[PDB]
Amino acid sequence: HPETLVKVKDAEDQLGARVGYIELDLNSGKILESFRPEERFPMISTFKVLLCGAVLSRVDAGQEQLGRRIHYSQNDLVEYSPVTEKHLTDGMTVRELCSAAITMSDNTAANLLLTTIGGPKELTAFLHNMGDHVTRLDRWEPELNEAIPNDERDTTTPAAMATTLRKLLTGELLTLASRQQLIDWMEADKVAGPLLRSALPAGWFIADKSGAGERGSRGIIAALGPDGKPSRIVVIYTTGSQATMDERNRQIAEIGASLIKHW
Ligand SMILES: [K+]
Ligand SMILES: [K+]
């Protein structure tokens, strides 16, 4: 609904930065509303859902086991690795790493998983192979969060990310076991606290992944809907703002409040 575009525009006024937005019908794939749908924005941590989608695809193809244990060392730890920093000696399984990466925003976990699939180049190849010719991952954590103005490395567009997430959560790319495992990881409630979840009415379903990077970069991807069943995909990104994290969060939430109101 255009009333939501009013809020997206208000957000740009408040943040002094670009905001990309898209609302997609989960069932049909029809774009319901958009703002800067084909402009690039850093994916930041939202790329982790795509990463684990590629991991699950390999599990489906028998090239990976969710129960496989991976050991690493202090040499592998990068900034913000809450789960991995405490399993240096125990190691972690592929399943535990995807859970840590998606639900706990663990960066080392994402790097370990990137290594298992062949790195940024293979994630990008995976994306292209499924029809996403826009999204690209070029670097590892933490450099992929640089958000350099006008840099296309590690970026997506609201439209590409929304369409790719729909394909991952519907259709045939993943087996039902994998689709649901991906959704379950996105449903866990740990990170996306003050964003779209804060605006969600009771009984509504939401599977999401938010991210924050350098230079004001922020983003969230989500599948949500009433009655514990998702029916739409929403993708919001912004980069370049000098506003506080709290200010950026409030704007994203206000956009969510509007989307819900005019559902
Ligand atoms: K290393
Ligand atoms: K989540």
Swiss-Prot record:
GO terms for molecular function: beta-lactamase activity. One of its GO terms (biological process) is beta-lactam antibiotic catabolic process. This is Beta-lactamase TEM. It comes from Escherichia coli. Disulfide bonds join C52-C98. TEM-type are the most prevalent beta-lactamases in enterobacteria; they hydrolyze the beta-lactam bond in susceptible beta-lactam antibiotics, thus conferring resistance to penicillins and cephalosporins. TEM-3 and TEM-4 are capable of hydrolyzing cefotaxime and ceftazidime. TEM-5 is capable of hydrolyzing ceftazidime. TEM-6 is capable of hydrolyzing ceftazidime and aztreonam. TEM-8/CAZ-2, TEM-16/CAZ-7 and TEM-24/CAZ-6 are markedly active against ceftazidime. IRT-4 shows resistance to beta-lactamase inhibitors. The beta-lactamase present on pBR322 was cloned from plasmid R1 (R7268). The class A beta-lactamase family has a specific amino-acid numbering system, sometimes called Ambler or ABL numbering and often misspelt as Amber. A multiple sequence alignment was used to derive a consensus sequence and then the consensus was numbered taking into account insertions and deletions. This allows use of identical numbers, e.g. for active site residues, despite differences in protein length. UniProt always uses natural numbering of residues, hence there appear to be differences in numbering between this entry and some papers. Changing E214K: In TEM-5 and TEM-24. The active site is at S45, E143. Substrate binds at K209, S210, G211. It catalyses: a beta-lactam + H2O = a substituted beta-amino acid. It holds the Pfam family Beta-lactamase2. Gene3D superfamilies: DD-peptidase/beta-lactamase superfamily. Belongs to the class-A beta-lactamase family.
